[PDB]
Design a protein around this ligand. Structure first.
Ligand SMILES: CC(C)C[C@@H]1CCO[C@@H]2[C@H](CN[C@@H]2C(=O)N[C@H]2[C@H]3O[C@H](OCC/C=C\[C@H]2C)[C@H](O)[C@@H](O)[C@H]3O)C1
Ligand SMILES: [Mg+2]
Ligand SMILES: [Mg+2]
Ligand SMILES: [Mg+2]
Ligand SMILES: [Mg+2]
Ligand SMILES: [Mg+2]
Ligand SMILES: [Mg+2]
Ligand SMILES: [Mg+2]
Ligand SMILES: [Mg+2]
Ligand SMILES: [Mg+2]
Ligand SMILES: [Mg+2]
Ligand SMILES: [Mg+2]
Ligand SMILES: [Mg+2]
Ligand SMILES: [Mg+2]
Ligand SMILES: [Mg+2]
Ligand SMILES: [Mg+2]
Ligand SMILES: [Mg+2]
Ligand SMILES: [Mg+2]
Ligand SMILES: [Mg+2]
Ligand SMILES: [Mg+2]
Ligand SMILES: [Mg+2]
Ligand SMILES: [Mg+2]
Ligand SMILES: [Mg+2]
Ligand SMILES: [Mg+2]
Ligand SMILES: [Mg+2]
Ligand SMILES: [Mg+2]
Ligand SMILES: [Mg+2]
Ligand SMILES: [Mg+2]
Ligand SMILES: [Mg+2]
Ligand SMILES: [Mg+2]
Ligand SMILES: [Mg+2]
Ligand SMILES: [Mg+2]
Ligand SMILES: [Mg+2]
Ligand SMILES: [Mg+2]
Ligand SMILES: [Mg+2]
Ligand SMILES: [Mg+2]
Ligand SMILES: [Mg+2]
Ligand SMILES: [Mg+2]
Ligand SMILES: [Mg+2]
Ligand SMILES: [Mg+2]
Ligand SMILES: [Mg+2]
Ligand SMILES: [Mg+2]
Ligand SMILES: [Mg+2]
Ligand SMILES: [Mg+2]
Ligand SMILES: [Mg+2]
Ligand SMILES: [Mg+2]
Ligand SMILES: [Mg+2]
Ligand SMILES: [Mg+2]
Ligand SMILES: [Mg+2]
Ligand SMILES: [Mg+2]
Ligand SMILES: [Mg+2]
Ligand SMILES: [Mg+2]
Ligand SMILES: [Mg+2]
Ligand SMILES: [Mg+2]
Ligand SMILES: [Mg+2]
Ligand SMILES: [Mg+2]
Ligand SMILES: [Mg+2]
Ligand SMILES: [Mg+2]
Ligand SMILES: [Mg+2]
Ligand SMILES: [Mg+2]
Ligand SMILES: [Mg+2]
Ligand SMILES: [Mg+2]
Ligand SMILES: [Mg+2]
Ligand SMILES: [Mg+2]
Ligand SMILES: [Mg+2]
Ligand SMILES: [Mg+2]
Ligand SMILES: [Mg+2]
Ligand SMILES: [Mg+2]
Ligand SMILES: [Mg+2]
Ligand SMILES: [Mg+2]
Ligand SMILES: [Mg+2]
Ligand SMILES: [Mg+2]
Ligand SMILES: [Mg+2]
Ligand SMILES: [Mg+2]
Ligand SMILES: [Mg+2]
Ligand SMILES: [Mg+2]
Ligand SMILES: [Mg+2]
Ligand SMILES: [Mg+2]
Ligand SMILES: [Mg+2]
Ligand SMILES: [Mg+2]
Ligand SMILES: [Mg+2]
Ligand SMILES: [Mg+2]
Ligand SMILES: [Mg+2]
Ligand SMILES: [Mg+2]
Ligand SMILES: [Mg+2]
Ligand SMILES: [Mg+2]
Ligand SMILES: [Mg+2]
Ligand SMILES: [Mg+2]
Ligand SMILES: [Mg+2]
Ligand SMILES: [Mg+2]
Ligand SMILES: [Mg+2]
Ligand SMILES: [Mg+2]
Ligand SMILES: [Mg+2]
Ligand SMILES: [Mg+2]
Ligand SMILES: [Mg+2]
Ligand SMILES: [Mg+2]
Ligand SMILES: [Mg+2]
Ligand SMILES: [Mg+2]
Ligand SMILES: [Mg+2]
Ligand SMILES: [Mg+2]
Ligand SMILES: [Mg+2]
Ligand SMILES: [Mg+2]
Ligand SMILES: [Mg+2]
Ligand SMILES: [Mg+2]
Ligand SMILES: [Mg+2]
Ligand SMILES: [Mg+2]
Ligand SMILES: [Mg+2]
Ligand SMILES: [Mg+2]
Ligand SMILES: [Mg+2]
Ligand SMILES: [Mg+2]
Ligand SMILES: [Mg+2]
Ligand SMILES: [Mg+2]
Ligand SMILES: [Mg+2]
Ligand SMILES: [Mg+2]
Ligand SMILES: [Mg+2]
Ligand SMILES: [Mg+2]
Ligand SMILES: [Mg+2]
Ligand SMILES: [Mg+2]
Ligand SMILES: [Mg+2]
Ligand SMILES: [Mg+2]
Ligand SMILES: [Mg+2]
Ligand SMILES: [Mg+2]
Ligand SMILES: [Mg+2]
Ligand SMILES: [Mg+2]
Ligand SMILES: [Mg+2]
Ligand SMILES: [Mg+2]
Ligand SMILES: [Mg+2]
Ligand SMILES: [Mg+2]
Ligand SMILES: [Mg+2]
Ligand SMILES: [Mg+2]
Ligand SMILES: [Mg+2]
Ligand SMILES: [Mg+2]
Ligand SMILES: [Mg+2]
Ligand SMILES: [Mg+2]
Ligand SMILES: [Mg+2]
Ligand SMILES: [Mg+2]
Ligand SMILES: [Mg+2]
Ligand SMILES: [Mg+2]
Ligand SMILES: [Mg+2]
Ligand SMILES: [Mg+2]
Ligand SMILES: [Mg+2]
Ligand SMILES: [Mg+2]
Ligand SMILES: [Mg+2]
Ligand SMILES: [Mg+2]
Ligand SMILES: [Mg+2]
Ligand SMILES: [Mg+2]
Ligand SMILES: [Mg+2]
Ligand SMILES: [Mg+2]
Ligand SMILES: [Mg+2]
Ligand SMILES: [Mg+2]
Ligand SMILES: [Mg+2]
Ligand SMILES: [Mg+2]
Ligand SMILES: [Mg+2]
Ligand SMILES: [Mg+2]
Ligand SMILES: [Mg+2]
Ligand SMILES: [Mg+2]
Ligand SMILES: [Mg+2]
Ligand SMILES: [Mg+2]
Ligand SMILES: [Mg+2]
Ligand SMILES: [Mg+2]
Ligand SMILES: [Mg+2]
Ligand SMILES: [Mg+2]
Ligand SMILES: [Mg+2]
Ligand SMILES: [Mg+2]
Ligand SMILES: [Mg+2]
Ligand SMILES: [Mg+2]
Ligand SMILES: [Mg+2]
Ligand SMILES: [Mg+2]
Ligand SMILES: [Mg+2]
Ligand SMILES: [Mg+2]
Ligand SMILES: [Mg+2]
Ligand SMILES: [Mg+2]
Ligand SMILES: [Mg+2]
Ligand SMILES: [Mg+2]
Ligand SMILES: [Mg+2]
Ligand SMILES: [Mg+2]
Ligand SMILES: [Mg+2]
Ligand SMILES: [Mg+2]
Ligand SMILES: [Mg+2]
Ligand SMILES: [Mg+2]
Ligand SMILES: [Mg+2]
Ligand SMILES: [Mg+2]
Ligand SMILES: [Mg+2]
Ligand SMILES: [Mg+2]
Ligand SMILES: [Mg+2]
Ligand SMILES: [Mg+2]
Ligand SMILES: [Mg+2]
Ligand SMILES: [Mg+2]
Ligand SMILES: [Mg+2]
Ligand SMILES: [Mg+2]
Ligand SMILES: [Mg+2]
Ligand SMILES: [Mg+2]
Ligand SMILES: [Mg+2]
Ligand SMILES: [Mg+2]
Ligand SMILES: [Mg+2]
Ligand SMILES: [Mg+2]
Ligand SMILES: [Mg+2]
Ligand SMILES: [Mg+2]
Ligand SMILES: [Mg+2]
Ligand SMILES: [Mg+2]
Ligand SMILES: [Mg+2]
Ligand SMILES: [Mg+2]
Ligand SMILES: [Mg+2]
Ligand SMILES: [Mg+2]
Ligand SMILES: [Mg+2]
Ligand SMILES: [Mg+2]
Ligand SMILES: [Mg+2]
Ligand SMILES: [Mg+2]
Ligand SMILES: [Mg+2]
Ligand SMILES: [Mg+2]
Ligand SMILES: [Mg+2]
Ligand SMILES: [Mg+2]
Ligand SMILES: [Mg+2]
Ligand SMILES: [Mg+2]
Ligand SMILES: [Mg+2]
Ligand SMILES: [Mg+2]
Ligand SMILES: [Mg+2]
Ligand SMILES: [Mg+2]
Ligand SMILES: [Mg+2]
Ligand SMILES: [Mg+2]
Ligand SMILES: [Mg+2]
Ligand SMILES: [Mg+2]
Ligand SMILES: [Mg+2]
Ligand SMILES: [Mg+2]
Ligand SMILES: [Mg+2]
Ligand SMILES: [Mg+2]
Ligand SMILES: [Mg+2]
Ligand SMILES: [Mg+2]
Ligand SMILES: [Mg+2]
Ligand SMILES: [Mg+2]
Ligand SMILES: [Mg+2]
Ligand SMILES: [Mg+2]
Ligand SMILES: [Mg+2]
Ligand SMILES: [Mg+2]
Ligand SMILES: [Mg+2]
Ligand SMILES: [Mg+2]
Ligand SMILES: [Mg+2]
Ligand SMILES: [Mg+2]
Ligand SMILES: [Mg+2]
Ligand SMILES: [Mg+2]
Ligand SMILES: [Mg+2]
Ligand SMILES: [Mg+2]
Ligand SMILES: [Mg+2]
Ligand SMILES: [Mg+2]
Ligand SMILES: [Mg+2]
Ligand SMILES: [Mg+2]
Ligand SMILES: [Mg+2]
Ligand SMILES: [Mg+2]
Ligand SMILES: [Mg+2]
Ligand SMILES: [Mg+2]
Ligand SMILES: [Mg+2]
Ligand SMILES: [Mg+2]
Ligand SMILES: [Mg+2]
Ligand SMILES: [Mg+2]
Ligand SMILES: [Mg+2]
Lengths: 48, 275
RNA sequence: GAGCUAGCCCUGGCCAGGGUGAAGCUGGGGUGAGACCCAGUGGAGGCCCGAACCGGUGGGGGAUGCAAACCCCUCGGAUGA
RNA sequence: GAAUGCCGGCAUGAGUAACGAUAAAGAGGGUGAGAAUCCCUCUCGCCGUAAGCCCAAGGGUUCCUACGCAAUGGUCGUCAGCGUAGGGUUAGGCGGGACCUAAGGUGAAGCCGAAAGGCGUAGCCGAAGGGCAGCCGGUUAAUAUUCCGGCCCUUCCCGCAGGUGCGAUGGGGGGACGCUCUAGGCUAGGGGGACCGGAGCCAUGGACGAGCCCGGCCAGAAGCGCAGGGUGGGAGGUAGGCAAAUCCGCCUCCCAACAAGCUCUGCGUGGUGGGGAAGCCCGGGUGACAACCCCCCGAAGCCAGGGAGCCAAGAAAAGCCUCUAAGCACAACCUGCGGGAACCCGUACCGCAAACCGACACAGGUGGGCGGGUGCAAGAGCACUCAGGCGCGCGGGAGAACCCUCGCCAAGGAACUCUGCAAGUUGGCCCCGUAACUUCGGGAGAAGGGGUGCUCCCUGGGGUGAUGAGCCCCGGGGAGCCGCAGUGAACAGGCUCUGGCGACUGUUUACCAAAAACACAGCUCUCUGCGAACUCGUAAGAGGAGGUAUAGGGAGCGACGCUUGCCCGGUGCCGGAAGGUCAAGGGGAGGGGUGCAAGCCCCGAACCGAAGCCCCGGUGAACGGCGGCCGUAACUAUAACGGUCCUAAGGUAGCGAAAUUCCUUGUCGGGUAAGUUCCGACCUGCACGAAAAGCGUAACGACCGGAGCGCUGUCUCGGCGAGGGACCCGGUGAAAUUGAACUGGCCGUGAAGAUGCGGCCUACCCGUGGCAGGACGAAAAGACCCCGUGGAGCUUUACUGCAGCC
RNA sequence: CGAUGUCGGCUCGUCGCAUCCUGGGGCUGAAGAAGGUCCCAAGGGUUGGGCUGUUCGCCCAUUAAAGCGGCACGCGAGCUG
RNA sequence: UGGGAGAGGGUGGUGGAAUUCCCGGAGUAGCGGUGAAAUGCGCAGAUACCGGGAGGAACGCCGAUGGCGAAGGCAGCCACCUGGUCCACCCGUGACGCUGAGGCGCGAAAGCGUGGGGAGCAAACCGGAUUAGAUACCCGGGUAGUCCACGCCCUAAACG
RNA sequence: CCGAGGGUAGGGCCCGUGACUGGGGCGAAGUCGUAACAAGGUAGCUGUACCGGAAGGUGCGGCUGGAU
């Protein structure tokens, strides 16, 4: 049956992307934590 | 004269439709329409604030002229009478001698080809507009402004009117469509005659899909819900109200008056509605 | 977190074929005029039958599955809420 | 040494289940160390509204070529979507951007919020919507509307010529729209040809034929032809389109009007450029100077912004055209022609799937376009087949039980069972024919019957063409032939009677409930005069609604019919300028502390003093509620009648052992041989009853009862047969579980149900196929039940607060 | 209570005897035939149906008879539900 | 042809008396009601009185033993549309007449549907009296309805 | 071919019967009230409506077949 992951490049980038994160106090704390943790990727990569 | 149908489906048994005889023109005036932005009942938050809305036929808004003191003295001809889907009343296409074109809601008895005019001096004829003070006591009247130059507010839907009762200083006394007696200021404009399409009230929707076309989504009874939802929700089996009948937000809904106590307009309400 | 699901908004798309035969209209009859009746035309409808599509009624199978809800037979809607 | 401990390792179950759709294989030849599995050929089977082909998403090198086979692949592997390496994606016209706007988002101005932030007209962003210029063929191992070939086109810049008041983000027009139905004419696509081109073929009894088999086109600028779309021309007035205006709108006059003209599309033609089969020969080559023609069918596509009807009344903005304003009229714009200029990103490949979403090369899920032929009434249905694609990445045997899916069955026919659950029956089309009841539509495919193939002959009408022939579509009558059977295969209702519930079509517990539940038109109450009520928000601001009482909110009821009774003492709500109570505050009689005193400081009675409550009324489609005992008639029985206690008032009509009836399978009637169910009645209704509606009700229902007919493997009562497994052999090889085990029966014993203790009995050692009585077998720290001064949801006249409202 | 699955049916039995039938007996208010009552006896047998979920029970048609109980109210790693 | 009387009928308009309710003022201890009373209303200011307003329904006197209509039935006043009818003249047609099963239309009140309207009145209903009871008569309330539009119903002591 | 009739299926009229139910007639001395006849003690009757153990009562309109 229809499962829950239905990938969509626009959806991905607009929801979790760098610019969404920066627009908001909470998304900025996300970027800041993943930086402090040393994540290689602060945001999901999509082809765009 | 609402039209019937033969019972050739279960729903056509009772369905009635407006007859549309007074309609003389079946597409609107392109310069007078704009897109009517459907809300779904949602506000700028995205939240439903009026339940059970959405899903209606697409519609264009028709700009209606509710001032009409805009063009004092300039007569206009009644070019057409048209269906407006944003309102119960029909609407009248007016060609000013100006060349300007405008819609008004269509009063009962109005005829294509006739002239209407607006102003302190206008004739007392169905379709004309004058400040309230210049209209004779006893005149039936519609599209009444409520405060001067603020726009027609009262008696706009199909079939309705206000009657002018008497004067008192700067104010005339109107008997509104609801039966209330109200002092309305005399410089408020009003249009002579009653709103038309009086047969509107006798249309029988006939089937559930019809309310759907109007953008009315099904209404769920509180008695049908659970306690998390509603005062009336819950109970094993069916259940009576079991408490003063209430709205979803808990306020009583049989009798409880809700007009604000200390409202400045109270001084201008002579007598509340009856019946 | 509404890329699942629920509602709504905007903008597009889709519904083989067959059946029934409303109003109206034309004519005929009718009458003082009428209602009305008859025939033809007409093509309405949360109309009928049935694919696609949407479903999930009953049974059977599956049950460390092909599958963390599937498969077979059967069955509901299918111009509409 | 234990913690259903943690991490890792390794056992057991076991050479066991399984190896992922039952569309299916066989052989020969090659390659190689090795071949059921790779390559090639021939035979066989499967899909073919796909299991073929083209887009979009998503994926991201998986594409092509060489070399490989450790691991991945459910087996094998020489093969591969695997490993190594090299190569491969080419655009002014395709798609997106340098264009537009939609919801929405963002947001100069502006508004609001302790902070963070929330809003917000314009504007900006935002597309699968609008707008916009490329078709056909060839080429590569791999890209092609991209390269190449042919023939077309767009914009930008600059120049020449002709023309004109040029000129905009401003005005205006247009763009610009629904649903159903649908006309003419075309095209796509298809069928046929006794015509045209072709390698060939004559078999096995016959055919050298008007034979078989193959093919008979595609693109195309101007011009022309056919068919459509769009559009009145002139003049005078002008106060409106937030400046202007010669434009637009409005008034008037004249001329034109089913036209025409102009304009724009589609289709045909068209210089020209391509393509071009079967067969045969080794992707190629020939065929081939290939032929390229006639007739018919014919779209849902095109002409298109076409037409008609209808109500639920159907985007925006740009491009474009017109108007004019600053300006400028040496300019500038318009048309023609010429030269020059024309960027960024994508393009490989998979794409109903082994490459996407499902941990897997997973029987599941995934939007758009094309989707051939024949027959079956039609069709995208069904069967078979084209092009094209496949045989589903374990096989080989065997022919037990048992299981699955399937076929048939004597006599009987529901006796089966909770129940005809299941499976039969029925089944398309044409014709005849069809009941109660009904809201006059319906019920209806009611029911029930008859017909159905092939052949010859006669004949009616339509389409195309020409009025004919031919081709095509609908028939009509007569006579015949064959079979068990003519929708001869496949796809395709069992019917009736009668209750309960719900009017109806709809909706629902994704994944145990589809229903009698929810919704529904309709009815009633009630709130709301608009800066409405109400809702979301601290607010601003939004929704309500660019609506205005024929409207909007809330509530119950639930089509329709006939109806909806009595109670206002309690609670609610509504009304009530009196009265009572009542907080802060007012007042300050009268006290008090302190100071020598002026004073400073504190307590403080009467009295004035909101809402709320009390109090007086109203109100039921507001919350709700609608009696008890005793007596009584000329047979008995029963009580129309009476007496009395109590109530706020004592249940009306209608219905009733009911989706409600405890006693209960009440009682009587029906149906049956027999009826706890069913239907009809009765009424001592444990415990119906009138919008938590009462009683009915045509139609409707995958709802729940009851009956009958039809027919059956449901059954008496089983039998046989098919295939997929089970079984054997080769390959690969799990699992939960598991204190250890050298693990029998009885009768007792034991913490009360013993392989394990006692006494007896029985018993050589080890497997394989089977069955499930036991190991209080597995699974899951019982969901029942209680306990914990454990949790959470929900309610209220529990307590205590808060928002909100007064 | 870190689970001893629960009513009825179906299927498959096996056991007790306080015996329903069949065999053998004594007493009878046993003439006969047929009953009654008690004794011995468990070898075998102990039907089909209508109602209900039912066990049970009632009823129909039969029978030599239409027995009563135990086995975790026998039997759900056997089915149903 | 010329004239007449008339509540004949339909549509629109519109006038005064009265009742009720509302507002203002003035005023106070009762009003109402009956056979008698009670219920009811009233110091929260009623009744009785004055002015203003709102609204529905009916039209006093004229009015009659009257008039008109086929009947049912029709009554303020006005205009319009319209039927019937009588008289005069003796002008026109030349028996063109009477009745009439069926058919069609009209048809008090009550009642029914859908809208509206609602002052007075009032089935039902509530209460107060009466009474043995009193589901009545009398008193206080009171909903349909009585009114208007359209559509039904089609009855009658529709009687002379 | 037609054909007595037999069979299947479905309608139409009639007759008989049916738990129970509706009112009707009749019946020497039952129970309840007293509606009508007199102004019958509320004139009666009346079509209709609604209500009530019962006769009846009331509303609306009509008749005199009403008294004084
Ligand atoms: C009056 C009655 C309530 C007496 C009651 C009967 C219920 O159960 C019995 C209780 C006594 N214990 C029984 C029980 O727990 N049984 C459970 C079974 O659960 C699974 O079987 C299917 C579930 C059925 C039963 C559940 C509850 C599981 O597989 C079985 O092993 C077993 O755990 C008594
Ligand atoms: Mg889903
Ligand atoms: Mg998605
Ligand atoms: Mg995307
Ligand atoms: Mg996208
Ligand atoms: Mg998206
Ligand atoms: Mg976001
Ligand atoms: Mg982003
Ligand atoms: Mg911050
Ligand atoms: Mg910050
Ligand atoms: Mg890094
Ligand atoms: Mg992130
Ligand atoms: Mg109708
Ligand atoms: Mg009808
Ligand atoms: Mg109209
Ligand atoms: Mg516009
Ligand atoms: Mg809005
Ligand atoms: Mg917004
Ligand atoms: Mg929302
Ligand atoms: Mg709301
Ligand atoms: Mg809504
Ligand atoms: Mg409206
Ligand atoms: Mg309208
Ligand atoms: Mg005012
Ligand atoms: Mg309505
Ligand atoms: Mg609408
Ligand atoms: Mg509604
Ligand atoms: Mg509802
Ligand atoms: Mg509920
Ligand atoms: Mg519920
Ligand atoms: Mg919630
Ligand atoms: Mg709560
Ligand atoms: Mg609550
Ligand atoms: Mg409740
Ligand atoms: Mg409930
Ligand atoms: Mg209940
Ligand atoms: Mg419930
Ligand atoms: Mg309650
Ligand atoms: Mg409440
Ligand atoms: Mg009011
Ligand atoms: Mg469809
Ligand atoms: Mg048919
Ligand atoms: Mg027809
Ligand atoms: Mg027509
Ligand atoms: Mg339908
Ligand atoms: Mg059909
Ligand atoms: Mg589904
Ligand atoms: Mg089945
Ligand atoms: Mg499962
Ligand atoms: Mg399936
Ligand atoms: Mg199927
Ligand atoms: Mg269907
Ligand atoms: Mg269809
Ligand atoms: Mg230890
Ligand atoms: Mg463990
Ligand atoms: Mg542990
Ligand atoms: Mg561990
Ligand atoms: Mg390790
Ligand atoms: Mg481990
Ligand atoms: Mg290991
Ligand atoms: Mg092992
Ligand atoms: Mg092993
Ligand atoms: Mg083995
Ligand atoms: Mg084993
Ligand atoms: Mg296994
Ligand atoms: Mg498996
Ligand atoms: Mg299959
Ligand atoms: Mg199969
Ligand atoms: Mg082979
Ligand atoms: Mg191999
Ligand atoms: Mg090998
Ligand atoms: Mg193979
Ligand atoms: Mg091969
Ligand atoms: Mg061969
Ligand atoms: Mg095909
Ligand atoms: Mg991937
Ligand atoms: Mg390998
Ligand atoms: Mg492997
Ligand atoms: Mg695998
Ligand atoms: Mg090799
Ligand atoms: Mg490549
Ligand atoms: Mg190019
Ligand atoms: Mg540039
Ligand atoms: Mg833009
Ligand atoms: Mg954006
Ligand atoms: Mg953009
Ligand atoms: Mg676009
Ligand atoms: Mg383009
Ligand atoms: Mg081109
Ligand atoms: Mg020019
Ligand atoms: Mg337009
Ligand atoms: Mg528009
Ligand atoms: Mg559009
Ligand atoms: Mg529509
Ligand atoms: Mg056509
Ligand atoms: Mg073409
Ligand atoms: Mg064809
Ligand atoms: Mg001008
Ligand atoms: Mg050649
Ligand atoms: Mg189409
Ligand atoms: Mg088009
Ligand atoms: Mg816009
Ligand atoms: Mg200048
Ligand atoms: Mg110059
Ligand atoms: Mg650039
Ligand atoms: Mg490419
Ligand atoms: Mg699929
Ligand atoms: Mg597809
Ligand atoms: Mg693949
Ligand atoms: Mg595979
Ligand atoms: Mg798959
Ligand atoms: Mg073909
Ligand atoms: Mg067919
Ligand atoms: Mg295979
Ligand atoms: Mg397959
Ligand atoms: Mg396989
Ligand atoms: Mg074997
Ligand atoms: Mg067969
Ligand atoms: Mg056979
Ligand atoms: Mg048989
Ligand atoms: Mg039978
Ligand atoms: Mg039979
Ligand atoms: Mg049976
Ligand atoms: Mg069942
Ligand atoms: Mg069939
Ligand atoms: Mg019948
Ligand atoms: Mg019939
Ligand atoms: Mg019937
Ligand atoms: Mg019936
Ligand atoms: Mg009928
Ligand atoms: Mg038939
Ligand atoms: Mg038929
Ligand atoms: Mg025949
Ligand atoms: Mg044949
Ligand atoms: Mg069928
Ligand atoms: Mg239903
Ligand atoms: Mg339901
Ligand atoms: Mg019902
Ligand atoms: Mg109903
Ligand atoms: Mg439907
Ligand atoms: Mg479910
Ligand atoms: Mg669930
Ligand atoms: Mg679930
Ligand atoms: Mg299920
Ligand atoms: Mg359920
Ligand atoms: Mg269902
Ligand atoms: Mg529901
Ligand atoms: Mg319903
Ligand atoms: Mg209703
Ligand atoms: Mg209402
Ligand atoms: Mg709030
Ligand atoms: Mg704050
Ligand atoms: Mg708005
Ligand atoms: Mg509402
Ligand atoms: Mg309903
Ligand atoms: Mg409902
Ligand atoms: Mg009826
Ligand atoms: Mg009460
Ligand atoms: Mg009260
Ligand atoms: Mg009360
Ligand atoms: Mg107070
Ligand atoms: Mg209660
Ligand atoms: Mg109470
Ligand atoms: Mg006596
Ligand atoms: Mg009653
Ligand atoms: Mg009963
Ligand atoms: Mg009942
Ligand atoms: Mg009960
Ligand atoms: Mg009972
Ligand atoms: Mg019982
Ligand atoms: Mg019984
Ligand atoms: Mg019987
Ligand atoms: Mg009884
Ligand atoms: Mg209730
Ligand atoms: Mg209830
Ligand atoms: Mg009923
Ligand atoms: Mg019914
Ligand atoms: Mg029915
Ligand atoms: Mg249904
Ligand atoms: Mg159903
Ligand atoms: Mg049954
Ligand atoms: Mg069998
Ligand atoms: Mg076999
Ligand atoms: Mg062997
Ligand atoms: Mg092996
Ligand atoms: Mg392996
Ligand atoms: Mg050991
Ligand atoms: Mg050992
Ligand atoms: Mg052992
Ligand atoms: Mg042993
Ligand atoms: Mg013991
Ligand atoms: Mg033992
Ligand atoms: Mg032992
Ligand atoms: Mg031991
Ligand atoms: Mg030992
Ligand atoms: Mg020992
Ligand atoms: Mg021992
Ligand atoms: Mg021993
Ligand atoms: Mg032994
Ligand atoms: Mg073995
Ligand atoms: Mg074994
Ligand atoms: Mg076992
Ligand atoms: Mg065991
Ligand atoms: Mg244990
Ligand atoms: Mg066990
Ligand atoms: Mg478990
Ligand atoms: Mg635990
Ligand atoms: Mg526990
Ligand atoms: Mg547990
Ligand atoms: Mg639970
Ligand atoms: Mg316990
Ligand atoms: Mg405690
Ligand atoms: Mg404790
Ligand atoms: Mg606790
Ligand atoms: Mg809590
Ligand atoms: Mg707080
Ligand atoms: Mg409030
Ligand atoms: Mg336990
Ligand atoms: Mg355990
Ligand atoms: Mg247990
Ligand atoms: Mg366990
Ligand atoms: Mg059985
Ligand atoms: Mg024995
Ligand atoms: Mg025995
Ligand atoms: Mg039984
Ligand atoms: Mg038992
Ligand atoms: Mg029993
Ligand atoms: Mg014997
Ligand atoms: Mg026993
Ligand atoms: Mg026991
Ligand atoms: Mg027991
Ligand atoms: Mg047991
Ligand atoms: Mg037993
Ligand atoms: Mg058992
Ligand atoms: Mg079980
Ligand atoms: Mg059991
Ligand atoms: Mg077990
Ligand atoms: Mg077992
Ligand atoms: Mg066991
Ligand atoms: Mg007083
Ligand atoms: Mg006083
Ligand atoms: Mg009034
Ligand atoms: Mg004469
Ligand atoms: Mg009448
Ligand atoms: Mg009347
Ligand atoms: Mg009384
Ligand atoms: Mg007395
Ligand atoms: Mg009244
Ligand atoms: Mg008279
Ligand atoms: Mg015979
Ligand atoms: Mg009397
Ligand atoms: Mg008397
Ligand atoms: Mg008397
Ligand atoms: Mg009297
Ligand atoms: Mg009375």
């Amino acid at each position: 049956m229809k499962r829950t992951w239905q990938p969509n490049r626009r959806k991905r980038a607009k929801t979790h992307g760098f610019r969404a994160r920066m627009r908001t106090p909470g998304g900025r704390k996300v970027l800041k934590r993943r930086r402090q943790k040393g994540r290689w990727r602060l945001t999901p990569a999509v082809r765009k | 004269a609402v039209k019937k149908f033969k019972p050739y489906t279960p729903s056509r048994r009772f369905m009635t439709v407006a007859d549309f005889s007074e309609i003389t023109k079946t597409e609107p005036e392109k310069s007078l329409v704009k897109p009517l932005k459907k809300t779904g009942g949602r506000n700028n938050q995205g939240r439903i604030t009026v339940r059970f809305r959405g899903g209606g036929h697409k519609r264009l808004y028709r700009i209606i002229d509710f001032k009409r003191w805009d063009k004092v003295g300039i007569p206009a001809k009644v070019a057409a009478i048209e269906y407006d889907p944003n309102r119960s009343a029909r609407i009248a296409l007016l060609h000013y001698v100006d060349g300007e074109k405008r819609y008004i809601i269509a009063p009962d008895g109005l005829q294509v080809g006739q002239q209407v005019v607006a102003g302190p001096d206008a004739p007392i004829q169905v379709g004309n507009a004058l400040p309230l003070r210049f209209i004779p006591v006893g005149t039936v009247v519609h599209a009444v402004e409520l405060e001067p130059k603020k726009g027609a507010k009262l008696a706009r839907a199909a079939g309705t009117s206000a009657q002018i009762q008497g004067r008192e200083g700067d104010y005339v006394i109107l008997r509104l469509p609801s039966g209330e007696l109200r002092k309305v200021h005399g410089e408020c404009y009003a249009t002579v005659g009653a709103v038309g399409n009086a047969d509107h009230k006798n249309i029988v929707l006939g089937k559930a899909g019809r309310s759907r076309w109007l953008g009315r989504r099904p209404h769920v009874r509180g008695a049908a819900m659970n306690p998390v939802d509603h005062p009336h929700g819950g109970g094993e089996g069916r259940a009576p109200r079991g408490r003063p009948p209430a709205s979803p937000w808990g306020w009583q809904t049989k009798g409880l008056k809700t007009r604000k106590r200390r409202k400045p307009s109270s001084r201008f309400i002579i007598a509340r509605r009856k019946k």
